[PDB]
Every structure is written in C-alpha cells, then in structure tokens.
Amino acid sequence: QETSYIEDNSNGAISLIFSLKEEVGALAKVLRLFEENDVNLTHIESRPSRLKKDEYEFFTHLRSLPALTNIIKILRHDITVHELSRDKKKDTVPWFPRTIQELDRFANQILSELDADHPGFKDPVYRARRKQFADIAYNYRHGQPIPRVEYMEEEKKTWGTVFKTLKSLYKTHACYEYNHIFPLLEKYCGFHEDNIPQLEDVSQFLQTCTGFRLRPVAGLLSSRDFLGGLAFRVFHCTQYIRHGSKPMYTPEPDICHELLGHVPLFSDRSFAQFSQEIGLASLGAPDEYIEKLATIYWFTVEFGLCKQGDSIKAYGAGLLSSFGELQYCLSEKPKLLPLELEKTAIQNYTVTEFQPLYYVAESFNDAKEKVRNFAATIPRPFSVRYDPYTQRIEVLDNTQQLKILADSINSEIGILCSAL
Amino acid sequence: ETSYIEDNQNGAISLIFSLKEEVGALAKVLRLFEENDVNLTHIESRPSRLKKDEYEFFTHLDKRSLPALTNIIKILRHDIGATVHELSRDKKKDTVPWFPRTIQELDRFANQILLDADHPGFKDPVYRARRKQFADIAYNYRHGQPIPRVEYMEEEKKTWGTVFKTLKSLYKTHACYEYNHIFPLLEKYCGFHEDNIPQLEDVSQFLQTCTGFRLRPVAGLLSSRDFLGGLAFRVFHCTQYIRHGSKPMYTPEPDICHELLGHVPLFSDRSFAQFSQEIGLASLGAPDEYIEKLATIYWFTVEFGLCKQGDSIKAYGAGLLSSFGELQYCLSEKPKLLPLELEKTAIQNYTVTEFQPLYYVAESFNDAKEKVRNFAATIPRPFSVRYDPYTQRIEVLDNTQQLKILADSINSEIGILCS
Amino acid sequence: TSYIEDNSNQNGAISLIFSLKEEVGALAKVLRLFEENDVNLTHIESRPSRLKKDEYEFFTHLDKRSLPALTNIIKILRHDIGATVHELSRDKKKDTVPWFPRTIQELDRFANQILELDADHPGFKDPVYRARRKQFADIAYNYRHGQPIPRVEYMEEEKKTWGTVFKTLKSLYKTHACYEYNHIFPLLEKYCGFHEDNIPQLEDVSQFLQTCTGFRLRPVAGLLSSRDFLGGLAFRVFHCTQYIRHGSKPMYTPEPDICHELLGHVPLFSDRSFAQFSQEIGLASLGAPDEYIEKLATIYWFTVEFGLCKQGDSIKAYGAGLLSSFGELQYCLSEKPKLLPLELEKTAIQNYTVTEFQPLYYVAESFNDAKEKVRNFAATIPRPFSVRYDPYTQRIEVLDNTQQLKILADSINSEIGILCSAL
Amino acid sequence: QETSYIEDNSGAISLIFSLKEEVGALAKVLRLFEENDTHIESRPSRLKKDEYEFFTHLDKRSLPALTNIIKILRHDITVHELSRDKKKDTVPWFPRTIQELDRFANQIELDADHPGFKDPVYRARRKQFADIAYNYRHGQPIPRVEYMEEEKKTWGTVFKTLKSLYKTHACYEYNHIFPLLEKYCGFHEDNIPQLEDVSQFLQTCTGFRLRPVAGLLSSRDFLGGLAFRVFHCTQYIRHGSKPMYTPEPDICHELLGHVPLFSDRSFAQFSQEIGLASLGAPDEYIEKLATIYWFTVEFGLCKQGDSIKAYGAGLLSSFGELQYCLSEKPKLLPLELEKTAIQNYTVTEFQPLYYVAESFNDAKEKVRNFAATIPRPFSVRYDPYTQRIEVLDNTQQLKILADSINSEIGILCS
Ligand SMILES: [Cl-]
Ligand SMILES: [Cl-]
Ligand SMILES: [Cl-]
Ligand SMILES: [Cl-]
Ligand SMILES: [Fe+3]
Ligand SMILES: [Fe+3]
Ligand SMILES: [Fe+3]
Ligand SMILES: [Fe+3]
C-alpha cells in the first residue's frame, strides 16, 4: 500500500490558549499565577483581542507538568481555555503552530540516505553529501536567509536531464497557470537547463508573488507538520537532488520535484489560497481527519487534474515533475472522476506505480470552497484564520464577527474604485 | 502656520502597467527596455492578482535616462493598446505623484529631510553631537535591518522620567479606553517605566505582534506625503532622540517621548491601525492640494483628535497624550468641540505653537475610518489602491475587469452559517 | 410641543406573538387551546416561519372583552417548554410591550383616535366651514384600508384658498427647496392636479406615491397620538387630512390641512431615499416606551417637519413645515437662526416651540445619513425584539434572530451587481 | 416529442429609457411625443436622484409616427425597444408592472380526445370558467363559483387518494403547509376551496397571488408572471368520467401540486428567479427555462437528509408518478443547468429520469448564476413596494447599488 500519510512523533510540547476580560484586574491576576508556579514572563504573551477590545489574548508554550496541571484547574473554574498537546492525550486538542516562528519546533522531526534500495546507496559521496543538506535544515530557523549551496557539476547534469525533458511537455500538458509563471522563473530565477536555482532566490520570488516562502527540510515530516505549515503559506522544501545514476526515478522528494512541480503553482494567488485552506483545516484536527487531508492533498496538490474549457490538464506537482506520468495522466488510459472530497478522503492509493485514477477539479476557487466545507466536518472546538499582518493564527470560537468585517472592507473598495 | 511640508537631483520616475499574454508579452516588453539600456535588475515582472492572464510590472528608475524612457511609454500605450501611469514626483505634466509600490521602496526617500538658535537646546557641541549620532542611524537604516539599540545617558533618562511621571497620572482619566488598555502591556513587554527609555526595536517588534505596525528611524521631519505614504504599509517613521533636558515640558520638534507615549499605544490597537492606514492609502498619488487636506485631517484626528466614550469624551491624539498642559485644557469647557466632518476639517486653519482653539470629536475609530474612505473618493486619482499584507505591496486597480473578479471573491465570501 | 400622549380605548387592543415547533404536533395543540376558550378561529393566524421549516408563526388580535379567557392561555404558552411569547397591550405596562399594528390592515383600529373644536380657530363663526369640517370627518371615520379614498368636489371658495397658498409658495421652491423637491414637483403638475387653480384628490396622489416609493395616503379626521401616526410610517403609510384652512387667513393654520400635506409632505415621499428614512422612524416606534416616543417625536420634528439638508456647498430645506410656510421658508435659509449638525443623541432631547418660528434648525448631511442615525438610535430603544417590514406580505416581522434575515438581503443585492457587471 | 414549451404569439410595443434633469429633458420629451402624435408615464429613478424613468403603452397601430422618435432619443443627447414580435435588434417584450400582466392574459374545448367531449354540460361549463379569466383584471377579487355535486366527487377522489401519500412521499415543506390549508383554506375531501380565499392565504405567507387563466399561455407569459410572484391558475376541473387522468392542468393540479409550495418563502424566491430570468430572454433561452421549470417545479425532487422526496407539482397531483419516482426505477442525476436545460422529456408517459436538487436555496442560486448566461443588455430586480421591475443598463445605477450594500452591513454584534 505505502500511503503518503506519516504519523506525527514526539518532552511533549504543551501549550495553552485562552482569552479573558478586563473587568476585574485580569493581567495581574493571571501573571501572578504563573510567577508563583515557576514560569517567567518569557513563556507567556499578552496581546489585545481584536474581537472585543476589552479582552486580552493569552498564549502559553510550556517540561513543567506539576506547575502546569495546577494553573488549568484554577484558571478554568474561577472564570475559556484550549489545551494543546503534542502527545494528544484525551480532552486535549492536537498541538499546532500558532505563529510562523513556532514552525522551528518540529521542523527537525523527520524519519531516518539510509535505505538500502535507494538509487544512490553504494556511493560514499552521495550518502555524505546528503548529510550536508540535512545539517542546513536542522540548523535553519525562521527569518534567516536560506544558505546557498554550490551544486557540483555531476549534479547540474541530473537537473539538466530532467529540466529539458519536461520543459517540452509543459506548453501542452501543464495548466495555464503553470505556463504563466514559468517564463518568469526563467528570467528572474535561475530556471535554466544548465543551472540549479537557489531556494533563497525562489523564496524571495514567491514572497513577492503570493507571500509564500520556502523552508529547508532534511527529509519527510509528519503529514500534520507539513500541512500545518501551509496555513502560514510556508512550504517545507528539500535542497538535495536525485542520484545521477537514474535521473528519472526518485523514492523521495528532491529539489527537482519541488522546484518543477510545486514552486510554479505556489506563485499563483488562487492556488496559494487553495493549498492554504488544506493547512488551515489541519490545525488541531484529530489523526483520523489528518489522513483524510493527506489523501485530499495527494489527489489535489500532488496528483490533481483540473478542467480547462472543453479539455483537461494537470496541475499536481507529482505530475508536473514526472516525465512518464505527465503523459499517462492526460491520455485515455486512466480513469477520471469529478472532484468530490467525501469520496477522495477515504480513497486508497499507491505511491510506487502511476495512479490508476485521477480526480478532476473544476477550478482552484471551486476546490478551495470544497476544503472549507470539509473543514467544517472536522471536529474542532474552534475555527482558525491566518493574519498576514501579524503572521499569527487567530483562534475563533465566534468566528462570524471577523468574516463580516472583511466583507465591509472589500465592498467599500468596489464603490471607491469607480472610474466611470 | 501649518504642519504641511511640501514634497521636494535623482527624482524617482516609476511606471505602472499590466499586459496580457496573448501572443508573447514578456519577451516583447523586456526587449523594449533592454534596447534602451535598461538592465533587468531595474525591472520586475510579477503575475497580476485577480487576473490569471496578466502580468504586473514594477520599475525602479531615477530621473536619469528619461529621454530613453519617455519613448517607451508611447510604444506601450499606442503600439500595444494598454493603460500606463507615469510617476515622476516632480510635477511632470500629465503625471501622477510618485508613491512607493513596495514596503522596501520606503528606503528611497527616507533621508529627504531639510540647528535653530531658539531651540530649547542651543548650539553646544555636547547636545548637537548627540543629535547627529541619532541622525546617522536613520540615514543608514534600511527596511530589513533591525533598529540599532542605543544606550541612553542618565541625563536623558532623567528628562524621560519628568515627562513620563507627570503624564502617567492623567491617562487613567483623560485617555481613551483603548490607551489605558494597552499601556499596561507596554509596561511589561516593552519596559515603559519612569526610569528607563525603551528601544524602538523592542517596541517595533511589539506592534508587529499586535497589528503588524512597525517602526522606522528618522532623523527629522519628512514631507507630509512621504510620512503619510508610509502609513499605507502600517509603517510609522519614528524619532530616536530626546528633547534637551533644560525644558523637559517643551519641545519644538517630535522626540522619542512624543512618539512612544503619544503615538505608539494607539498603533497597538488594530481598529486605530486600520484608520491611520486609510489615511496613508488615501495619499498615494494624491495632488498637493489634497495632501495638505490629509495632513489637516491627520492633525485633527491622530495628533489632536478627541473621541466619544459613552456619556463622556476622552483624548486619543498624540499631541494631547504627550503634552501635560494641553491634555488638561482639551477636556475643559474652554475649547470648542465639533463633530468630525472632513469637508470642514480638511480646510480648517490651525496653529502649531499654542493649544488648539477647537477640537474635532470622532464617534469611533471604525466610524472615522469610513469617513476617510468616503473622502478618498473625492481625491482625483486615475486608480484606487489597496494594501496586500502577504506580499507587502500596493495593488493598483484601473481596469473594470479587475472589479468583476473582485465581486466573485465577495459573493463566495457570503458564508451563511445561520447556526 | 407636538408630542401627543397615547390614549387607549375601553376595549384596549391586546395581541400576542409567538412561534412554536411542529414536533409535538403544535397546530392541533395550540389551536385547541384557543377553542377551549371562547376564542373564534377567525381571530387567529398561523403562518409558516421563514428559514425555519419546522416552525409556525402565530398571530392573535383580540381585546379585553375576554380577559379571563386570556390571562390563562398566556401562562400555558410561556411557562411550558417550547414557546416564547410577547404580549402586546395598549395600557398594562406590567410585563407587556406597547401595542403596535402587525399588519397594514390593523391601521384601521386606531385610525379614529382624534382628540375643529377650538374657539380661537380662524373659521369659528362660520356655519359652513364648521359644518364642512364634519363632512370630512365622516370620510375618515368610515375609511378602510381596502377602500379607495372618496373624492370630494371642493367649493370655489376653497380652491381660492389653495391657489393663494400654491402661487405664493411655488415661487420659493426653485431656490429654497432641496433638489429632491424640485425634482418631483414637475411630475405632480403633470400626472396629478398640482395647479394654481385646482385641488388634487388624495386618491390620485396616493396612487402616484405608490408607483414612486410604495407610499400610500390615509384619510384622517384630526390629530392622532404620536405613536399611531409614527407607527403608520413603518408601513410607508402617511395619515393625511382632507379638509382645508379657512379662507379668511390663507397664510395661517393652527392644524395640518391638505395644503401643508400636499405641498409639504407628499413630494418628499416620492423619493426613495426619503421614504426609507421616514420608514425607519416608524419602524423605531413599534413597541417603544412612551418616554422614547416623545424622543422620537422630537427627531421627527427637526427632520420631517422642520428639517434642513446639505446640498453641495449650500444648504436647502426639506421639512414639510418649511415647504408649506411662506415666512419660515425664507427665515430658515437666512443667517438669523442657529444651525447645528444632526445628531440624534442631541436632537432627541432638544426642546422646541410650535407657535413661533424655530430658533434653531438641524442640518442633515443626506437622507441616507439620517437613516443610519435613526437605526443607531433605534438600538438604544429598549425593546425585546427588532422589527422589519415585509412589502411582499405587508406585515411586520418581529425579530430576535434578526441576524439570519440581513444575510439574505446582502447575498441577494450583491448577486445582482455581478449579473450586470459581468463585463 | 411532446414538450411544455409554448411559443409566444402576437403586438405590444413598449419603450424604456432614462434621462437627466440638468438639461430640459422632461419638457423636451413630452413635446417630442405630442409633436409626433398621451399614454406615457414619467417616474423618478430609484437609483439616480437626477434621472426620470419613462413608460409608454402603445400598440403597433400608428407605427410611422414612432420610428422617428427612436432616432431622436438615441442619436441626440440609452433606449431599449420592446416588441411583442422579433424586430431586428430588439428585446422580447415583457411586463414591467403587475398591471401589464392583463395585456396578454387572453393569448391562448373542441378537442376530440378530451375526456369530456361528448357532454354538452361540461363543454359549456368550461366556457363559463373561460369568461371569468378573460374578464378578470388585476386587483379584482377572483369571482367565486358554486361547484356542482358531480364536481366535488371528482375532487374528493383525487384528494383522498393522494392525501394518504403526502406524509411519506411529499417533502417536509409540503406536509408543513398542508395542515394550514385544511383549516384556513378549506382543503377537505368534500369541498373545493375558492381561488380568492387561497390567493389571500398565499399573499400573507410569501406575497404570492393567484390569477385566473382560461388555458395555457406562452411560456414567456406564464413564467413572466412568476417574477411578480403571480401564478396563473385554472379554475375548472377535470371531467368526472376519469378522475385519475387529465390532459390539461385543472384546479386539482394547481391546488394540490402547485399552491402548497408557493406558501414557502424559500420556494417562492426560487420560482421567482426563474420568472426574473425570462424577462427579455430570447426564445432559445425560454425553452431552456421551460425545461428547467419542468424538472424542478413540475417534476423536481429534493434531498431531505439521508433520503429523497418529491416536491414537484406534477407528482403531488398524480397518483401514479408519486409512487413511481421513488421506486428506484428512473435514473437520478444532480441538478446542473448545462445538463437539465437541454434534456429532452415527455409529458404523456411517466418521466424516465429525475433531477435532484440539494435544497430550494441551492437551486435558487443556480438560476441566478444562469441568469447571467442569458444575453440581455440589462439586469433585473423586483421592487415589491412599487411592484415594478428595475432595469439596470447604465454604469451609474451600480455605483449607487454598491452604496446601499456597504451601508447595509450593520455590524450589531450584540
Ligand atoms: Cl488574500
Ligand atoms: Cl486586517
Ligand atoms: Cl426599499
Ligand atoms: Cl424576500
Ligand atoms: Fe511534494
Ligand atoms: Fe506626531
Ligand atoms: Fe406635518
Ligand atoms: Fe403546472
């Protein structure tokens, strides 16, 4: 079977989320509870609430269980609290990153290079060169510029072989959005047959296009971690390349799969929103619905097809980076079905051979709304929204007050921008 | 007297235009610029938002090499059939006032400032040199860099204490609810204490986590257009120096005291951040006549504005929250109070030396915000503006088709949950 | 002042409002509860609740004739699980909201709640005028919502009085009246009988307003309570007098006449923006306490009767008291009176006079701006529900879950901007 | 292939145009018609405080005095010409006001295969009902008729045999309204309710009203009446010889199939959008609307939880199809305009397939999206206050429409 769902592995991170009113002396009453239980002001933030203006929002990221199981009791009865845990005990919500900076916590929790069947296994250089890229990811923290790497001549050859063979297929097999950005990457990035572009230059390009940014990663994270990073429009990226012995095969993601399959789509604004809704749906979702999201991600982002007029084309990264399947998925051999998440979430699939079937999406805006509807069925005691101004996640139990405030803004832009 | 500072070798010249990829657009245009000795480093081509078949172009040029550029605009408009807006900043005929297209572009004219014998501090090598030290930090500051921290002298902390202690006693009763709501937070996470001056870096990081607002060092006073323009990006140009210790209760210029105690606490409230942002957004490309009008509104709202809080009135203007005398005078029955109406406030005359004879009372920040939005329409501009926090760029909307797409995002945004 | 306190009849109208679920079989359980008492079915309505496929809305319109059979029914509905009820009465005040009509037809109930009976009236020593007034009173007392307004042949002495007021005022409208007035007036001259030498019929006028903004006229004998008069505006109904001032002093009238109402009020009701504004005032009066009715009467005074509006760099008048008064229309635009910006929190309590000209006037930025101020003031009025008018069914909707209906209005209006703008 | 689409037959010629008040337009226009010709209305525009809307009600008679006006209005100083017939570059005529529904309400017995053909009484009794419709005008109360005992029996046979199936086969909305119709409208096995009492009931629920009609109108006319929430209704009844068959709509089909749904507001809004979509639509798109109407209002099914039920009038008034559509025999597809609008169907035999709508609110928005696909130089919205249609052709009408929306966002938030 070998599905793409990777369970999350874990001192388990324990974080709290709660807001309180300023009617009685609230800041003093809460801060003293933390100082008395050996908690400095560095593991607690107090920010104003946007939904009432007379409330404070509190964030705690705590290693110290006996000093933590006592605050929850005194805090809940004497006055709403959401407990986030990485080990996901009962009566708790699965932990998720509240700010882009918190992505640094579990960015190095990949599994296991060390696979005997890997193409480049009987190679001391390649096996060692992989450790170099892994160290870049393990030591990278948010905000930092992605360290640049000088690719060897033997490695640019592999890139060239994959680049030239796929560039000939994009004009006819890739969706319009792909061919819309690709010329830009050829001019403003090092997207050339005889050059490998640096992830830093690409990240800076995405940031100026849709706000998406890249993050080095050593290997494969848990599905929870990966999708969680999409809520912040952060895409964990590998910096290594396949072994030059078989440029047309890879059991794992490499810079080729992600630069030629993933990056161009994240440059489109409509697609950035769609993929973001998938990540947003994973924040605090149980493991049962994470696998469902991983399956949707598989049949939409990696191996998804889209309707373009009277014809169909491909937009999945797994398809746009594979020379053989990109032609097989567009033929009349595979089975095509309309995109319906209730069926895709449970559909079984394989990772070794080509996909027997493909799901066709009407559009990205159409697929986006399907994710929102599916996000509602996911049992969560709150709603989530991303704030690009502060780059934090907003926990929303009365989420309805914020969506309306966004409409009142968008509507005043249609009557003001009235040229004629 | 007035607070309006008019805008003043290498005048920034920028173009704005979008094009369709019908046959080949990128190559045909890029060659048009390369043929006129324009390196690609001075041109960006990014996909247009709301339009999947258009490219958006950004150019970063100077007044230099204009004659090889005034010909390109003609080939883009007549030979291609597309709309183009020329930004020149130097009242070029048939041109739009230049404005920053990206937050990074704030670095261009951040040093375009204009030593007074009558100044509280006089020409004395000690103080004047300390002032030049802060000026060098601002001239050398860039958007990405962290604000350099400074070790304030005891003589400077003493002055801060005099202003801090005397004003803290009035905030609980004279300042609006939003002010007293944030101030306790600034005392813990920014070090707002009688015997300490907080660093703009620690403060800037605090606003970013509250409403996304960030601080920027400045040596002196910018043009009203330049200063207000930075508000569109929720960027507040901030001074790092402090008044001379001889007269702690007087300052002819803004200082770190005026900026930390008058301006910063309000920028921590999102409702106020949106309001102040609409003022900056309204200034992008506005004629000089309407820039002065916006400077007057900013004066009577952000600097010297009053707000209704229930059956009583309180103050939220920076000019009041940093002045010990006027903060008490504005709440008395001596000054004249009017309802906030921009058509009357935009033309109202005012003074900067003495207290304000009158004050304008705003119903709320969300109400005052929409009043600016309505006023933004009266400003003659060939386009509308909106800020994109994801990419930190301004999106110009000139084509009607861009609005039809904007309507789709709204009709879909009608989530009728109804429980 | 113009505030007239509300007076109830011996048979004070008592009506109930409540919705219930069809889970336990409510139609039978509720309908039978009334059948057990001396309550006829004809005085009970059961209608489906919109957006709640499993709820029925119930309306009952009775009075104190059967009180002992009514104080027991209300208890079974409120105390038992499944039903919330609002009791509307004209004067109990214990646990009831001030009564208001739920349907346009119910305006017939208190349409005859009148207080020419003043000795000092200009036409007092006149058997004809004194008698002619009773003739108009019978028309109002006998008028019902469905009937067409009876036409009357005005005497030549009465056409002359109208002409005196018409000619002297028409010369001032082009320069003193707001843009909306001079926009409608030419139409009234062509499609109605707005001429110097003719008095138009209220029926012809009512039909004209209905085709403009849906407003309709209703004959009235005299002065109603402020609640009754204002209440009728929620249905875009304007109570109108059909008589005319005495010809002895065409330039003076202590009471409203067809001149004040045809030349002052109707032309504004033809504009949608003003019709919506005045409607929000009526909507704000439904179920409002007597203390807030007087406050509402003051707003109406400084807006509809004696209100001024901003028109560009200049200001013009739109109040009916000014558009029908020859002296005040010139005095309000001069520099003698004091002008203040319109703020309901200030206007609601401002004192005023009715005999002499107004010392001050309130200037509104626009009709849409004044409308939103009334909505804001409507929230401060203590009411256990919100109100909205349904022009399709011509009924009032009591709304505690009002938030569910506003969304359907936005989602429709927005989907109409994408159909035309599909270019 | 028997179809339900009835082409329009002739002719009413009407004009629509707006003008500004800055220049002397009202005077210039009023003299323009008198100089070339009295039946003209001028009302203020509800979207521009400085514009007037003009309505003219003339016949094709005296055409040469009209072909000159169109040039002076278009070339000098926007105008839409409505012609009951296909004139080149003109929009199909549609009623602008509820009163205009009276014009072609008579634009429709002697049929050998009719059940009651060999009966002078029934054949004559039908002309009695036709005279009521031909002479009926808007605003009038629907004349009541005393139904004969022979006719009440026919109603009873259909009523009792179908009432037993509604609780299990009819949608939730139907059984929600039906108990009310039994008490306040007299829906009983041994009594036929009068259209006047029923119309008054619908008006108080969703504003829908009934209008007598002699026979079958053109699809445009019938659908057009739905834009005003007006439902053209037949007052006669099928011949008592075969109570379970009728080649035409009768009071049974209309009271038991159609009326109860019009009492639900969500359905009233949905059906109204269909009528609104037909105003000024070409003949090609009228048939498409007639097909959609067929598979939604007449023979439409809806999802009710994990089960499926029927809400179409053709099923709720037919004893055989009401059981056949739920018997898993026909094939069911999701409601999609591109597929349903062109699907062919029959009227004689049961339907081979049925289209399932998620809900009434879901089907309504699909029509609105489809309303854009109809080529029209304007958009339409209904004003219940004045009961006329608002044409939106000029850009100025939309900027004002944007203000009323942004302002309509009242954030009470408690
Ligand atoms: Cl966005
Ligand atoms: Cl925001
Ligand atoms: Cl309206
Ligand atoms: Cl409605
Ligand atoms: Fe991948
Ligand atoms: Fe300042
Ligand atoms: Fe009056
Ligand atoms: Fe039918």
From Swiss-Prot, chain A:
Q: What is the effect of changing residue 242 to K?
A: In PAH deficiency; severe
Q: Impact of mutating residue 129 to S?
A: In PAH deficiency; severe
Outcome after substituting residue 162 to A: In PAH deficiency; severe
Q: What is the effect of changing residue 215 to Q?
A: In PAH deficiency
Documented effect of changing residue 189 to G: In PAH deficiency; severe
Reactions catalysed, as given in the entry = (6R)-L-erythro-5,6,7,8-tetrahydrobiopterin + L-phenylalanine + O2 = (4aS,6R)-4a-hydroxy-L-erythro-5,6,7,8-tetrahydrobiopterin + L-tyrosine
Question: Which enzyme type, at the first EC level?
Answer: oxidoreductase
Describe the effect of residue 282 to Y: In PAH deficiency; mild; reduction in activity is probably due to a global conformational change in the protein that reduces allostery
This entry's Gene Ontology molecular function terms read: iron ion binding; phenylalanine 4-monooxygenase activity
What outcome is documented for mutating residue 344 to S in this protein?
Answer: In PAH deficiency; severe
A GO biological process of this protein is: amino acid biosynthetic process
Q: Impact of changing residue 35 to D on the protein?
A: In PAH deficiency; severe
Q: What is the effect of changing residue 142 to Q?
A: In PAH deficiency; severe; does not affect oligomerization
Tell me the outcome of changing residue 322 to T.
In PAH deficiency; severe
What does altering residue 250 to A do? In PAH deficiency; severe
So what does mutating residue 272 to S actually do?
A: In PAH deficiency; does not affect oligomerization; reduction in activity is probably due to a global conformational change in the protein that reduces allostery
- Give the record's family classification: Belongs to the biopterin-dependent aromatic amino acid hydroxylase family.
Name-wise, this protein is Phenylalanine-4-hydroxylase
Report the source organism.
Answer: Homo sapiens
Encoded by which gene? Answer: PAH
From Swiss-Prot, chain C:
Q: What is the effect of changing residue 179 to C?
A: In PAH deficiency; mild
What's the effect of swapping residue 145 to R?
In PAH deficiency; severe
> What is known to happen upon mutating residue 158 to Q?
In PAH deficiency; severe
Q: Tell me what effect the entry lists for residue 44 to N.
A: In PAH deficiency; severe
* Impact when changing residue 369 to H: In PAH deficiency; severe
- Outcome following mutation: residue 142 to S: In PAH deficiency; mild; uncertain significance
Result for mutant: residue 382 to L: In PAH deficiency; severe
- State how changing residue 182 to D affects the protein, per the record: In PAH deficiency; severe
This protein's GO cellular component annotations are: cytosol
How the protein is affected by changing residue 132 to S? In PAH deficiency; severe
Q: What does the UniProt record report as the effect of altering residue 66 to R in this chain?
A: In PAH deficiency
Per the UniProt entry, the effect of residue 83 to D is: In PAH deficiency; mild
Q: What is the effect of changing residue 253 to N?
A: In PAH deficiency; severe
Instruction: Tell me what happens on changing residue 275 to S.
Output: In PAH deficiency; does not affect oligomerization; reduction in activity is probably due to a global conformational change in the protein that reduces allostery
Instruction: Name the reported effect of residue 186 to T.
Output: In PAH deficiency; severe
Altering residue 253 to A: what's the impact? Answer: In PAH deficiency; severe
Q: Per the record, what is the consequence of mutating residue 182 to S?
A: In PAH deficiency; severe
**Family of this protein:** Belongs to the biopterin-dependent aromatic amino acid hydroxylase family.
Q: What is this protein called?
A: Phenylalanine-4-hydroxylase
Question: Where is the organism placed in the taxonomic lineage, from the top?
Answer: Eukaryota, Metazoa, Chordata, Craniata, Vertebrata
From Swiss-Prot, chain D:
The annotated consequence of residue 378 to S reads:
In PAH deficiency; mild
Impact reported for residue 185 to G = In PAH deficiency; severe
Consequence of mutating residue 312 to V?
In PAH deficiency; severe; uncertain significance
Phenotype upon changing residue 142 to V: In PAH deficiency; severe
The Gene Ontology biological process annotation of the record reads:
amino acid biosynthetic process; catecholamine biosynthetic process; L-phenylalanine catabolic process; tyrosine biosynthetic process
* Stated consequence of mutating residue 223 to V: In PAH deficiency; severe
Q: Which GO terms describe its molecular function?
A: iron ion binding; phenylalanine 4-monooxygenase activity
Give, from the UniProt record, the effect of changing residue 279 to P: In PAH deficiency; severe
Record EC number: 1.14.16.1
Q: Which reaction does it catalyse?
A: (6R)-L-erythro-5,6,7,8-tetrahydrobiopterin + L-phenylalanine + O2 = (4aS,6R)-4a-hydroxy-L-erythro-5,6,7,8-tetrahydrobiopterin + L-tyrosine
What's the reported outcome of changing residue 246 to N?
In PAH deficiency; severe
Query: How changing residue 356 to M affects the protein?
Result: In PAH deficiency; severe
So what does mutating residue 173 to A actually do? In PAH deficiency; severe
Top-level enzyme category: oxidoreductase
Enumerate the NCBIfam families for this protein: Phe4hydrox_tetr (TIGR01268)
Q: What is this protein called?
A: Phenylalanine-4-hydroxylase
State the taxonomy lineage: Eukaryota, Metazoa, Chordata, Craniata, Vertebrata
Q: Which gene encodes it?
A: PAH
